[PDB]
Amino acid sequence: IYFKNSENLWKTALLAVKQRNRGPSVLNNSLLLHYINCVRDEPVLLRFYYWLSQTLQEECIWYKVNNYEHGKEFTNFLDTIIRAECFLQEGFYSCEAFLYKSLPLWDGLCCRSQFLQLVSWIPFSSFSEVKPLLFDHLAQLFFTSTIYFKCSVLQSLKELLQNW
Amino acid sequence: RMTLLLRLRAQTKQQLLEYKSMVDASEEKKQIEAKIEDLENEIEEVKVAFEIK
Amino acid sequence: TEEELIRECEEMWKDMEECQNKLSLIGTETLTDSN
Amino acid sequence: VLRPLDKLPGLNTATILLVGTEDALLQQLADSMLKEDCASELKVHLAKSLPLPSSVNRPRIDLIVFVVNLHSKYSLQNTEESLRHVDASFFLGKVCFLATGAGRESHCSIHRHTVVKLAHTYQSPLLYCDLEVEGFRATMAQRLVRVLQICAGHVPGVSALNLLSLLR
Amino acid sequence: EFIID
Amino acid sequence: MDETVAEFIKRTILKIPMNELTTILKAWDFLSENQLQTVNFRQRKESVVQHLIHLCEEKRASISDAALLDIIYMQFHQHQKVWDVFQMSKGPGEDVDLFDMKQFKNSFKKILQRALKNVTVSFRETEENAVWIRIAWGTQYTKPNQYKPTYVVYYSQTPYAFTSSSMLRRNTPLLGQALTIASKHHQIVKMDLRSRYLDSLKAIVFKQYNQDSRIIHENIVEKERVQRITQETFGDYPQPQLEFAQYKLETKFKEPLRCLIKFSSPHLLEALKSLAPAGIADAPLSPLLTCIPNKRMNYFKIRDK
Amino acid sequence: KSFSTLFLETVKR
Amino acid sequence: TPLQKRLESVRKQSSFILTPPRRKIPQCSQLQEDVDPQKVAFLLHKQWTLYSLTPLYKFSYSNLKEYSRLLNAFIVAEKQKDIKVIFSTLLGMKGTQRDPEAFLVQIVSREGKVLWTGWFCCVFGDSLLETVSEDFTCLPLFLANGAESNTAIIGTWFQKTFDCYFSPLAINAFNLSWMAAMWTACKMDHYVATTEFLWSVPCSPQSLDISFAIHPEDAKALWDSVHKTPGEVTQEEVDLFMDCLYSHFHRHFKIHLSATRLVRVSTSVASAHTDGKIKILCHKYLIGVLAYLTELAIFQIE
């Protein structure tokens, strides 16, 4: 099958032998994520933009059919996205392009801790060009949601300030 | 019954404010690019007015 | 206690009613088209 | 024509008025608006066209939420046919534009720009949601209540007028 | 149709 | 045990699903109770379709009941091959005092083989008093084509005889022709009911179908009226049309304007009933659609007024 | 109308 | 320039500046340069399942045979989990001279029984052309006619070898009504098919559909009633054509088609669906129908 051996009987002997010897596309790759951390090239952040956008769209349309169990792989995919951004230390250009698209539609609690960690990793833009796109919907939602979203945005924008 | 009464008083201190603001607006009897600039001026001088309040 | 705060609350309710009838005489019910 | 301040408020009553052609989604949104036990007596009103047949004793409507089903152009054309029965003093704070069906984006007979242009040309908040799913109702219905406590004056710091200055 | 077919 | 007879039986056996082998095979009586135990029905499909065909190889199967097997197959699958509805009409006089099943099976086969001399007409008089004819068509130059037959459910004494709209060949004026001659009628008229649900056509043509304190709905007096008019135009249990109720315009837009409105639903009359309450339709939903069963016909032919 | 108790007492709540 | 320009494009698109576009009426497109008449006529009356395909990285219209071999050895490999794959450039299915040339992908099975004939094109797609680098050959459209099993496998091969991704293009009822209006606004003659608009009411228990199948000439004289500005179609004009449909359907049946959604718009120019199985291309207006389809696939891409 896959490293399926009949040496299991010999493996007990191989276990004693080991004891005797002792006695005598890029998100899920941390060792390669460092490479793209070191290149702000086009053919690398454009293949990444395109995979990330089509994964934040297809897996977000996947919400509109289940919304219950798909909220644990997309959430665990957004978590890897956020971890990769924290390591690489710049907001992926597909994650503000996805936030700008999906913020007006966004409710308060749907991937709140994950959407409001993508807001923190946003490339530094002029406020006259980023406020209407994002901060006008993180205020439309800020003023209509409970303290646990107001604190989850003021924490989101607290990390956004640190990143900017 | 007193905490609920205080909630009533806080609600009607503000509904009265809404009524009086509308009454004064109807008592009162152009540059759309600046019609929002003298409008944003309000919510920066209103903001100081009912922030110190 | 209640009798003191309720006097103020009902006085400003009288003001609420006075301003509502003031808003009941302007009565424009002004309309808003696409402009 | 409806007016924001023709009727006196209740005591703890914050009575919203949902205006939309489809009433199944309106009923679901109203059920979600009262599922949480808030501190305000929410008397939710449903409707299809704001003409709203003239029945006295109707409470002081503190909010009208024009639920615009982006799937159906009827829910829009009836909304603009219901926006011509509103006060200019009603669109300041006590008017929201719910855009249900959006986000699915494949059934939208209305482009989401047309609804945002509609809600921006009346200078009122446009709150997007998807009323067919409960998971997006209970989090949006609690947004229509926290807006409702603002316009009804239940939060004693923020007026209805102050609301659109925050949601602009 | 206006009940024409 | 013949040409286009054993093969036809094989081709009509695998069509039926695994559940209804016994139910269908008990009906056509080629397999007596002894023969049913020989074939084990529960193993596989190709095993049963091979041992069952062998049981009629030893029984010397003929097309006369090979078509009958297709008849019982269709009686449990009448919700395919969308049915036409023909309407007979005698002139002035007494009724058909002699509608013998023998005489009708003779007077249909005789007239049908008079012109379509190569056909395998097979009647199966059903227990609901509805003669379930099946005609395998084919001109005199060719053998009878059992690949696509035209089942005809002539309700025995009724003027109405449903017909499977399979090809609508030059035989459909002869299918009505022999139907109106065997049954002692005078005129055949396709009443223009064309629905796939035969048990729903039978009801329509014979008129046997109906025989919170905080949430203040402002338009409650209007919703109640919407429900009233919906409950006064669709009384109870609307039958499933499930057919393309065509509407071919010839109307001036308020010279004429043509379109061909086709309502396509899995259950049409229960979808129109759920239109006005859902806000898609006005409360007085137009007679135009509500009188689909009341008119007993959904491909209309009247004009403007 | 008069509020006072007529509104507050009626809503015991 | 190379990436931040796409950032600005996305920002502008999400900003939603007024977008009732005065789109030009589809113009009778003389078959430009070398469009294979047999091949083009083969692509016309065939139902394409619409997809939005991201730019093909490291793609070249010179290495056709080796890509065909790699994809053929992968198609029969998925059968292991009789078939030929012929990559075929089309040479003329482009709007501007700078657009990437459209190329086909056909699963040919002894004789030329073309099983799948997938198709990639970029016509009047200079809004994604000026945003990709030189290494990306941006083909926003993907047009697969064969079975979904083969489409969702050649799509995986393309994802693996070009880092291009296939979001299934879904034409919303808004764009469906738009393309319905402009395709009755053409100057075509000898109307192939009746102008049918397949509606679908939003009933929860039932799934009723409606086919407003106008006579193609009656839908042209009806469009001329709502056509006032020449050359360009307005969103007001499109909505007036759709509203003339609505008020001529509710006039008879008393049910509001505006309360429903378009699912298919059959026209003598081109039939079009919503769920993806969209493009039937009856007439040779296809350089404009595909222009709309690419500019809609660009929207899903960006």
Q: Could you write out the DSSP letters of every residue in F80-127?
A: SS-EEEEEEE--SS---S---HHHHHHHHHHHHHHHS-S-EEE--EET
Of F103, F175, F180, F86, nearest in space to F135 by CA: F175
E5 shares contact with chain H (CB less than 8 Å)? no
Distances (CA, A) of H133 to F281, H5, H19, H59: 52, 11, 27, 12
Instruction: Bin F29: left if φ > 0, else alpha if -120 < ψ < 50, else beta.
Output: left
Of H191, H258, H254, H256, nearest in space to H219 by CA: H191
Burial class (CB in 10 A: 0-12, 13-18, 19+), F253: middle
Beta bridge pairs of residue H57: H136
Q: Which chains sit next to G, with 3 or more Cβ pairs under 8 A? A: B, C, D
Asked if G13 and B5 come within 8 Å (Cβ–Cβ), the reply is no
Of F186, F193, F204, F184, nearest in space to F89 by CA: F186
Residues present in chain D in total: 168
Q: What is the resolution of this structure in A?
A: 3.3
Q: Across the interface, which of D21, D31, D45 has its CB nearest the CB of F279?
A: D21
Of H245, H227, H247, nearest in space to H236 by CA: H227
Amino acid (one-letter) located at H241: F
Asked if G13 and B4 come within 8 Å (Cβ–Cβ), the reply is yes
Q: B13 is written with which tokens?
A: 């201190």
Return d(Cα H175, Cα H295) in angstroms, integer. 11
Cβ atoms of residues A137 and A102 within 8 Å? no
Q: D89 is written with which tokens?
A: 């003093």
Q: Across the interface, which of C17, C30, C33 has its CB nearest the CB of D8?
A: C17
Judged by CB atoms within 8 Å, which residues 1-5 of E form the interface with F?
1-5
Which sign, positive or negative, has the C-alpha torsion D154, D155, D158, D160? negative
Structure obtained using: cryo-EM
Q: Are strands D63-66 and D16-19 parallel, antiparallel or unpaired?
A: parallel
C7 shares contact with chain B (CB less than 8 Å)? no
Return d(Cα H10, Cα D87) in angstroms, integer. 37
Return d(Cα H131, Cα H140) in angstroms, integer. 12
Return d(Cα H218, Cα F253) in angstroms, integer. 10
Please give the span between the terminal C-alpha atoms of chain F, in angstroms, as a whole number: 61
Return d(Cα H302, Cα H289) in angstroms, integer. 20
For every residue of D15-48, DSSP letters joined together read -EEEE-S-HHHHHHHHHHHHHS--SSB---EEES
Cβ atoms of residues F297 and F271 within 8 Å? no
Of A75, A76, A28, nearest in space to A51 by CA: A28
Question: Which stretches of chain D are DSSP H helices?
Answer: 23-35, 73-80, 112-121, 138-151, 160-166
DSSP-derived 3-state class of residue H181? helix
Question: Which stretches of chain B are DSSP H helices?
Answer: 2-27, 32-35, 37-40, 42-52
Distances (CA, A) of F131 to B26, F83, F122, H236: 83, 15, 10, 59
G6 shares contact with chain D (CB less than 8 Å)? no
b/e for A86-114, b at 16 or more Cβ within 10 A? eebeebbbbbbbbbbbbbbbbbbbbbbeb
Phi first, then psi: give them for residue H135, nearest 5 degrees.
-70, -20
C22 shares contact with chain B (CB less than 8 Å)? yes
Distances (CA, A) of C32 to A128, C6, D80, D90: 30, 40, 10, 10
Beta strands across the sheet bearing D63-66: D126-128, D95-99, D63-66, D16-19, D45-47, F216-217
Q: Which helix (H) or strand (E) holds H269?
A: none
Give rounded-to-5 percent helix, strand, coil for chain C: 70, 0, 30
Beta strands across the sheet bearing H272-273: F245-248, F260-264, H209-214, H195-200, H261-266, H272-273
Return d(Cα A160, Cα A141) in angstroms, integer. 17
Across H63-188, where does the E strand assignment appear?
Answer: 84-89, 103-108, 118-121, 136-137, 141-144, 166-167
Asked if A107 and D139 come within 8 Å (Cβ–Cβ), the reply is yes
Please report the domains of chain D, with CATH numbers, ordered by start residue: 13-167 (3.40.50.300)
Please state, as a whole number, how many other Cβ atoms lie within 10 Å of the Cβ of residue D39. 12
Judged by CB atoms within 8 Å, which residues 64-123 of D form the interface with C?
80, 83-89, 91, 121-122
Q: Which helix (H) or strand (E) holds H48?
A: strand H48-53
Kindly give, in sequence order, each residue whose CB lies less than 8 Å from that of residue H181, ignoring residues fewer than 6 positions away: H223, H233, H237, H238, H241, H242
Cβ atoms of residues D1 and D85 within 8 Å? yes
Cβ atoms of residues D61 and D15 within 8 Å? yes
B23 shares contact with chain C (CB less than 8 Å)? yes
Distances (CA, A) of F66 to F3, F108, H212: 12, 19, 44
Of F61, F67, F53, F65, nearest in space to F144 by CA: F67
Return d(Cα A161, Cα A122) in angstroms, integer. 10
Cβ atoms of residues C23 and B20 within 8 Å? no
Return d(Cα F279, Cα D22) in angstroms, integer. 6
DSSP-derived 3-state class of residue A117? helix
- Which DSSP letter does residue F259 get? B
Residue of chain D whose Cα is closest to the Cα of C30: D87
D112 shares contact with chain A (CB less than 8 Å)? yes
Question: Which stretches of A62-146 are DSSP H helices?
Answer: 73-88, 93-102, 112-118, 127-130
Residue pointed to by tokens 């793609």: H59
Residue pointed to by tokens 């939602």: A141
Return d(Cα H179, Cα H21) in angstroms, integer. 12
